[PDB]
Amino acid sequence: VRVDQNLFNEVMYLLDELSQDITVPKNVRKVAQDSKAKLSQENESLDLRCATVLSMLDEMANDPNVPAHGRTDLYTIISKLEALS
């Protein structure tokens, strides 16, 4: 319980921060927006929500327009989702 909810809480906070971060590209903010909505789709299985979000964030982490600090922010979130999955 605790271990998964602390990871989930951190992922939501970090995605919210990323969505508001003017130092990463528009498309990264939008993916962060869509990710946090997907994780909030309380009618769908968590493992499933996480898989879709992991796919979305991985795509962004591989976009060469993303600045180094934004890539690390993406990897931090990915790393918590893979621990939660």
XYZ file of C-alpha atoms in Angstrom:
85
model
C 0.000 0.000 0.000
C 2.312 2.691 1.287
C 5.108 1.947 -1.118
C 2.876 2.133 -4.228
C 0.920 5.176 -3.073
C 4.049 7.181 -2.289
C 5.297 6.387 -5.794
C 1.927 7.342 -7.291
C 1.784 10.580 -5.326
C 5.287 11.510 -6.463
C 4.476 10.687 -10.100
C 1.384 12.928 -10.009
C 3.303 15.806 -8.457
C 6.222 15.455 -10.880
C 3.906 15.230 -13.918
C 2.082 18.301 -12.716
C 5.350 20.182 -12.383
C 6.465 19.015 -15.838
C 3.160 20.131 -17.384
C 3.780 23.647 -16.017
C 7.470 23.844 -16.945
C 8.065 26.588 -19.549
C 11.672 25.375 -19.998
C 10.612 22.195 -21.836
C 8.852 22.122 -25.211
C 5.112 22.510 -25.620
C 4.770 18.883 -26.701
C 6.376 17.661 -23.462
C 4.016 19.770 -21.346
C 1.084 18.314 -23.292
C 2.236 14.735 -22.858
C 2.638 15.415 -19.122
C -0.944 16.810 -19.138
C -2.313 13.752 -20.938
C -0.320 11.403 -18.688
C -1.682 12.787 -15.480
C -5.266 12.562 -16.900
C -4.647 8.949 -17.913
C -3.324 8.054 -14.455
C -6.499 9.667 -13.063
C -8.811 7.391 -15.166
C -10.055 5.621 -12.058
C -12.332 3.280 -14.180
C -9.277 1.507 -15.745
C -6.666 -0.882 -14.218
C -3.549 0.770 -12.768
C -1.152 -1.555 -14.546
C -2.856 -0.520 -17.824
C -2.791 3.229 -17.061
C 0.899 2.904 -16.216
C 1.700 1.026 -19.425
C 0.125 3.719 -21.601
C 1.835 6.517 -19.705
C 5.193 4.702 -19.848
C 4.829 4.524 -23.642
C 3.994 8.216 -23.909
C 6.902 9.317 -21.684
C 9.391 7.015 -23.376
C 8.532 8.658 -26.726
C 9.179 12.044 -25.227
C 12.453 10.945 -23.593
C 13.630 9.974 -27.111
C 12.598 13.229 -28.789
C 15.874 15.013 -29.671
C 14.284 18.457 -29.095
C 13.896 17.772 -25.388
C 16.586 19.543 -23.253
C 18.796 17.431 -21.019
C 17.125 18.512 -17.780
C 13.692 17.640 -19.215
C 14.948 14.192 -20.270
C 16.085 13.559 -16.723
C 12.705 14.736 -15.423
C 11.059 12.257 -17.790
C 13.371 9.425 -16.691
C 12.638 10.174 -13.021
C 8.887 9.773 -13.633
C 9.395 6.696 -15.830
C 11.548 5.159 -13.075
C 8.830 5.562 -10.446
C 6.140 4.197 -12.771
C 8.299 1.108 -13.479
C 8.724 0.597 -9.743
C 4.888 0.997 -9.293
C 3.973 -1.298 -12.192
